[PDB]
Amino acid sequence: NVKCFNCGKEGHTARNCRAPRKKGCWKCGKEGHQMKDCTERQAN
């Protein structure tokens, strides 16, 4: 299993997901930066 960032549902990933993906931060939510970039709750 692998929790898809885009939709949440397991068994597949963000790229695989048959759904339009997110622009901004996946975890924190806020755009203008990715989850990678994020300075908010940056730890995991």
Next chain:
DNA sequence: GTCCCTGTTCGGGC
């Protein structure tokens, strides 16, 4: 793609 499998956004990898 049933699943793999993660920042850039589809494509081989099994």
